[PDB]
Amino acid sequence: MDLKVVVSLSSRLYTDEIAKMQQRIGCILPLASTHGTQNVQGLGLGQVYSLETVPDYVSMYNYLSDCTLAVLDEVSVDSLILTKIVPGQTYAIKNKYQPFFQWHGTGSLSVMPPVFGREHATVKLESNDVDIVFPMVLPTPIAEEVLQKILLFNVYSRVVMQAPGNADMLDVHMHLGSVSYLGHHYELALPEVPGPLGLALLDNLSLYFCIMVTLLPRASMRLVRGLIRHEHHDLLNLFQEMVPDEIARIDLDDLSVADDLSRMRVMMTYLQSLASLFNLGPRLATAAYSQETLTATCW
Amino acid sequence: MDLKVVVSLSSRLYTDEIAKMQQRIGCILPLASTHGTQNVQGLGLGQVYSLETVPDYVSMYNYLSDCTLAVLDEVSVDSLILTKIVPGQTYAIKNKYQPFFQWHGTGSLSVMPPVFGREHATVKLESNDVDIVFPMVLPTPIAEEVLQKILLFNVYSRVVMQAPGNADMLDVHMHLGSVSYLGHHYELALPEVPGPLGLALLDNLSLYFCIMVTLLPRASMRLVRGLIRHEHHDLLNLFQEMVPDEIARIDLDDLSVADDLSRMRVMMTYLQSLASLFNLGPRLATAAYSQETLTATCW
Amino acid sequence: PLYDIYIGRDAGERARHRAVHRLMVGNLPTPLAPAAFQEARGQQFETAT
Amino acid sequence: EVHHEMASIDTGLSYSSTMTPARVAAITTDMGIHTQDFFSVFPAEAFGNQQVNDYIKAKVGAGAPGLCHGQQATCEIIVTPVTADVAYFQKSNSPRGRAACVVSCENYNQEVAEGLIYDHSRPDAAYEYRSTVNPWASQLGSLGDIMYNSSYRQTAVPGLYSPCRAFFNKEELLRNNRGLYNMVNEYSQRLGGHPATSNTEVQFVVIAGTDVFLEQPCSFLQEAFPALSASSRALIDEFMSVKQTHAPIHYGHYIIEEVAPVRRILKFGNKVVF
Amino acid sequence: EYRSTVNPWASQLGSLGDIMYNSSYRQTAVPGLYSPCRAFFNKEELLRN
Amino acid sequence: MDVHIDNQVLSGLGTPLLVHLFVPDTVMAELCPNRVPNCEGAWCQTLFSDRTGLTRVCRVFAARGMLPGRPSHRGTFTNPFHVAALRFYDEGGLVGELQIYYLSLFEGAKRALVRGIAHIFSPHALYVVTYPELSILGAPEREFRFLISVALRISASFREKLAMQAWTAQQEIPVVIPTSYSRIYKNSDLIREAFFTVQTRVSWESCWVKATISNAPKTPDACLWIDSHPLYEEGASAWGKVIDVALGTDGHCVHLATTSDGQAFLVLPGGFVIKGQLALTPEERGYILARHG
Amino acid sequence: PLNRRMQYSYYFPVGLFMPNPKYTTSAAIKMLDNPTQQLPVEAWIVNKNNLLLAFNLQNALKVLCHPRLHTPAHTLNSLNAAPAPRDRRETYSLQHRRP
Amino acid sequence: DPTFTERGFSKTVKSDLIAMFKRHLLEHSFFLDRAENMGSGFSQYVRSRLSEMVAAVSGESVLKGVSTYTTAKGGEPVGGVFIVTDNVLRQLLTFLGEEADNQIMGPSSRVPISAAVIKLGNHAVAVESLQKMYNDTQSPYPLNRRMQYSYYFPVGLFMPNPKYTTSAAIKMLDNPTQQLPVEAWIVNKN
Amino acid sequence: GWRPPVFGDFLIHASSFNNAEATGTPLFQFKQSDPFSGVDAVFTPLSLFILMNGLTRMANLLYDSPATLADLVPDFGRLVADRRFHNFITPVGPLVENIKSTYLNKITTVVHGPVVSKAIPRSTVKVTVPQEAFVDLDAWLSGLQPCPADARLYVALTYEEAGPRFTFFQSSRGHCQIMNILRIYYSPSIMHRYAVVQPLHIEELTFGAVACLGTFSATDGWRRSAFNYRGSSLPVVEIDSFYSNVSDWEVIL
């Protein structure tokens, strides 16, 4: 029943840190330990997402899917008092994330790691020399479209770095800068640079999607030719006309025999690891949202 | 709020059987109907998997999904005492299986038919002329790996047919045959003929694959075509300086934001569906584990 | 009843039985339906027609 | 929920309890005619031409709104050559044409019992002089064997009772082979043999048996009892007139007087045969 | 079971015995001279049970 | 009919030209004995003589058809002078090779669009559909003469081994003689009939042909491929039986057993066994590897 | 629970033929039909409520008009899948031989 | 009878109940009139019929403790009342003798009711005849019910051409292959 | 016995919601663009049959005129072009309370949890849908199949040539094969849609979307009540013991 647990800090917090936590009381955290009371390094998402080393996105996804989520309730001078989240119980949320994002009644909350700047997302604790990093929560179709636009932007930016002429950056910015949901207009800045080195958050989802999208038609023609029998579902035949012709023209003899097993197997692994990503990790629903009170009754 | 079922045995079983069944205590098995008193035939999985019939795995997944699963609690000479699974309650669990995989903390578990070994998971009751067939519970990544292997085998055993033996010696037995793990390699049982059921699943896969090949974006193919020749990476190690000429024939048109945005949007709408065409098994979230005891706390 | 089954000689493999249809009622064997049955059936046919 | 558990043990070795049929209260299943249709039993098979199959299905083959007599009895038909003797049908005998008693032969010898059931080089134990009345049913691979053996057909829809299933099933005949004390115990301790249901219209096969009480002796003896059968109105009118002097066999017409363990009062108008 | 009706004019809707003794008539004389077959051929008094 | 557009959207975009052919069940009565199974796995291949040799293997699905308005076509639906061959199987033990020829097809494709044509190899009438989107004598003989040359060499090899062994016999299989006749040492009657039938037996699916085509070293070294054709021509001869003996025991069986190494054994009734040797040039290996595998 | 339900099996024949010497026991019946030629084609059954009923060929056709009568393939399979069949010596007409 | 109704009501059980309605309607109506032909079965049949009637009535009252009327000798209570007519009453007293203490004390406000008593099976049952006082008001006695049951008979049917017979005696000489009936005979009330 | 269900409160304008509606019909909510504090614009399935075009006679007797509804969803003809209308129909659950007001109207439903009222110590209710436009997908394709514990009610919304239509499906087997069996069910209506597919571009290809409303107590079945409105004679399936757990729209084709 009583599931509120306290993390105890090593050193006394400064006043700026106190007011910074009082700004962000009712929000979500990753909780590394199922038992609550243990050292401060667990509750931070800084071990996975740090200032020092460039983070790949799937690491944060695999970390968030596993570890539990907790809601801060109280901040005192030597203590942080947290509430664990278990399904089958109702809780409270305030949207103290920074980028204001409108929460409707009966909407679908999704918890996704932040693509924004680090200073926007985290609090540094100079007193205990640690970092606490807050996972972003955003509505489900908006989060879908956020992933869409940042992924397509990574593809266009990497292409224009490959070949400058083919891609116009103004046509990229005018379309991908704007996000419209239900008459609410939010302008989101894209990642600043891809660079020659490994880029900030993306380039891993992009390459996985790219190897997947190139393997998809080559795998699909092989599968459709392999499938044909009596008892196969009839609609397949109706869709045999639906394929574009040049995709249909491919001969199986070119790609070697064991390489069929290689390309198919690699493509299937990428599909299955890739599909559950777009369901967008941890999910919740909210019964009622209060705009003037900024309070969401969630479960 | 009280989960308890007793199964009344028809005739008494011998001491040799009661010894091994008491060894099997604490393991999952599927039951047919939600009643206090059950017949023994619905208790065993062996009704869906007879010895004489051709092995059909995906239909056993179909059978195991419908059949409410129970945990063996007490083995007595006329009685098998089981508690069941409400989706929203927490109960202890034990692992003692012959193809043995050590479980991880906060790694989700899936239930499968016993693909690996016929005698290893099962115990026959010749006193009552049945067989009790224990299913296989695995951590989710290697479970998805075995699922992909069985589906690709149900394809390629159709594909090889007869004429190339050079297909037969490697394709049928290398990727599809062995499941690797850390310091381990375990065999799979391969059906002599690829039988029924899996082919309707391949039909639905082919439907989604044709609809997805209708909507493919070009810029990602540009990223692949640029990176496979101009640079080298570990993800691209499948692709040498050679490109499939397929992507060259699809690669003639220019790039545009407005088309790729919508193409990506529809692919987002369709990759959400593949999680339910992929999953097929019940999920159990592990919250605690005891390596010394082989007794976890699932959820 | 309807068919007649026989065995051919085996050549290289053991021969399998073969069935040919009797096609008519009178192709029944005389132990199963005798001549008296046939003429009585004929008279009943005549009364019916 | 209140739970209460009891224990029972039998003191003496041999049997100390006996049940007995005393007085018939009612006959629920009528003895009428209702031939079971095989387009319901095998809906999947068909002839060659669609038109001819549609015609044959429409002419003959075609829930019930109400019934006055009671639960209908499913009638199953075995074809039989026309030189079959009357005297085989007047006395208690299996429809196969051969005796089906497995109790007599030696215990646990499947080949010996299957020799008695299914060999025709040696005559049946019912009659030495003939081997079989209808070889279209008795012999392996004959039309009766195809028609009513369980698990050879494999395409029949379950849930439709078959009376000849108890007589033509090789497994259910083979189970009787054991010692007779085992038969006596298993008779009352266990149900089975796939008995038909009670208090429905079309007499399905049983599944539940929740408080449903069957005792079937004919599965043990492997015979069926003959009923009143009359070839014409003349013989049944005379048999209703005079019991003792009636002809069992006329010139070409025959009559079978009912040999049933429940003697039934037969009333026609004002004349009574009992 | 083998036959449908012994007397087809007696049973059927609109048939002769029906038209003789249903409630479908009204031209008929007042309630006096009770009809026996009335009790056999009403719809409503039959469906009362 | 659906098989044509299925091919044109999947295999017709891999192979250039197609001729759509419908085979009556009477033509099917040639290959298959005593069976009418559906013809899904049927593999059609081309084979052209006197220039070069090649086969391309493809399935066109066959289903029985009522769709002809003409009553007569009720039945199954699936450089001229050359061959096409359909290899037909099921899950059971049934393998047949049918040979369709040209100049029935190019003349037949002349205008339910249908026309009747004749078989040359196994003479019956076939029916050709035309969809709205649309040196003679040496040419058949080769598959005959090639194989029959092998038989002659094999038969001559038997003689050489008898020339090894002073021209009598030896018994390699424990079969008791049926009786100790006085009128049995005219068994010269038997061995002559071997050289009668072995030379008059030629088919593509001979036992030694399958012995030539080996998937593995070890299991064919452990396995024997036999065929027994009866004496003097009573009935249908069996080829390609596997041994994963009783043949010597029963009469009417000049048993022939080939190992994958080309070693052969002619077994007579009474268990007399004569060993024979095979000689295959790489041309012959190329031909058998082309067609059989 | 004493009220048991006892389940029996009955059978009755129909369509049978009497051999050539034909005899009558009963002296009461005087039918017009010639005794030699007569043959029974139908049966009469007493119902539970003592209503006379007719069993006839037409009612019997709901089993007599089914493919499981006519096709021999399962009879053939059960006949030849045995170890030893009958001595295979039979040879005459079996297939026509063209001149 | 709870034997027939134990499985609840179903189509077959309702049909068997209707069939037994017909059987008992033909067989055990006017039982006292059929007692004449039985002869030696004078008493036992009437005792079984009345005891079956007493058995049909349920013995359970929901109030569960209602006080009872008693016989003048006391002890065992009064179970039921048979109401009859005068000739029926005299015949029942002839077949069933052994009249007990008539004077039944059971009703309160002790009074000698004079409800003629007979002992049936286990229980004391009073038998009463109220015909006299309804006669003294010249009104018909309401237990003299009138039953209306219908009859039907056919005339003019054809016998099918394979004619048969059973009676050796009759010689109609009508040349029986061509004979047909054109009229019917009814046996009168008298 | 479980925790009390999380109620949701809603203020609808009374002209787009009838007071006469039975207690327990499921309701569906539509999202407005600039103002949504005022009018929630919740729909009932009988209203959805009117906004999409003897059920029709009752749907016209209850709801008269439609242009208020056409004003509430102005872009319906643009949404059916793009297959975006299913992205706005959110499921909310069955009805419990209807506090009567002239201009506004106070709807209280059950978002999640076992369906119940709130005044007395939690009197239960039932959830009702009409038997027409309702297809049991357990009697549609019918050893012995096992008897599961729990049954699921799904919802599908399908854009046929005569516009979009919604269906409710009752099965008990699993979520991973109800999709495949629903493709097998909507196969012939799919066969009637690809007449005029080829001129129209990529976005139209989606055939419908599937959500999972909840899990009602199986091994029982349902009943067949009716509507007691004046002319109604309208048969309606009713189910007890309902536990609402509205899901996401999963795409079918």
Swiss-Prot record, chains A, B:
InterPro entries: Herpes_capsid_2
Cellular compartments per GO CC: host cell nucleus; viral capsid
GO molecular function, one term: structural molecule activity
Location in or out of the cell: Virion; Host nucleus
Superkingdom per UniProt: Viruses
Keywords per UniProt: Capsid protein, Host nucleus, Virion
Keyword Lipid biosynthesis in record: no
Biological function: Structural component of the T=16 icosahedral capsid. The capsid is composed of pentamers and hexamers of major capsid protein/MCP, which are linked together by heterotrimers called triplexes. These triplexes are formed by a single molecule of triplex protein 1/TRX1 and two copies of triplex protein 2/TRX2. Additionally, TRX1 is required for efficient transport of TRX2 to the nucleus, which is the site of capsid assembly.
Quaternary data: Interacts with TRX1 and major capisd protein/MCP.
Family to which the UniProt record says this protein belongs: Belongs to the herpesviridae TRX2 protein family.
Protein name (record): Triplex capsid protein 2
Gene name tied to this protein: TRX2
Curated annotation (Swiss-Prot), chain F:
Keywords: Capsid protein, Host nucleus, Late protein, Viral genome packaging, Viral release from host cell, Virion
Record localization: Virion; Host nucleus
GO biological process: chromosome organization
Domain of life: Viruses
Database matches in InterPro entries: UL17-like
Keyword Transmembrane helix on entry: no
Pfam families, per the entry: Herpes_UL17
Gene Ontology annotations for the cellular component aspect, listed alphabetically: host cell nucleus; viral capsid
Function: Capsid vertex-specific component that plays a role during viral DNA encapsidation, assuring correct genome cleavage and presumably stabilizing capsids that contain full-length viral genomes.
Family per record: Belongs to the herpesviridae CVC1 protein family.
HAMAP family reported in the protein's UniProt record: HSV_CVC1
Subunit structure: Interacts (via C-terminus) with capsid vertex component 2/CVC2.
Protein name, per record: Capsid vertex component 1
The organism's taxonomic lineage, starting at the top: Viruses, Duplodnaviria, Heunggongvirae, Peploviricota, Herviviricetes
Curated annotation (Swiss-Prot), chain H:
Localisation: Virion; Host nucleus
Superkingdom classification of source: Viruses
Transmembrane stretches, start-end: none
Record's function text: Self-assembles to form an icosahedral capsid with a T=16 symmetry, about 200 nm in diameter, and consisting of 150 hexons and 12 pentons (total of 162 capsomers). Hexons form the edges and faces of the capsid and are each composed of six MCP molecules. In contrast, one penton is found at each of the 12 vertices. Eleven of the pentons are MCP pentamers, while the last vertex is occupied by the portal complex.
Subunit comment: Homomultimer. Makes the hexons and eleven out of twelve pentons. Interacts with triplex proteins 1/TRX1 and 2/TRX2; adjacent capsomers are linked together in groups of three by triplexes, heterotrimeric complexes composed of one molecule of TRX1 and two molecules of TRX2. Interacts with scaffold protein; this interaction allows efficient MCP transport to the host nucleus. Interacts with capsid vertex component 2/CVC2. Interacts with the small capsomere-interacting protein/SCP.
Stated family: Belongs to the herpesviridae major capsid protein family.
Name this polypeptide is given: Major capsid protein
Species of provenance: Epstein-Barr virus (strain B95-8) (HHV-4)
Span covered, complete protein: 199 to 444 of 1381
Swiss-Prot record, chain I:
Keywords noted in UniProt: Capsid protein, Host nucleus, Virion
Protein name per the record: Triplex capsid protein 1
Family as reported in the entry's similarity comment: Belongs to the herpesviridae TRX1 protein family.
Oligomer and partners: Interacts with TRX2, MCP and capsid vertex component 2/CVC2.
BP terms from Gene Ontology: viral capsid assembly
GO molecular function: DNA binding
UniProt gene name: TRX1
S-S pairs: none
Localization in the cell: Virion; Host nucleus
Full-sequence portion shown in this chain: 84 to 364 of 364
Function of the molecule: Structural component of the T=16 icosahedral capsid. The capsid is composed of pentamers and hexamers of major capsid protein/MCP, which are linked together by heterotrimers called triplexes. These triplexes are formed by a single molecule of triplex protein 1/TRX1 and two copies of triplex protein 2/TRX2. Additionally, TRX1 is required for efficient transport of TRX2 to the nucleus, which is the site of capsid assembly.
Domain of life: Viruses
One GO cellular component term noted in the UniProt record for this chain: host cell nucleus
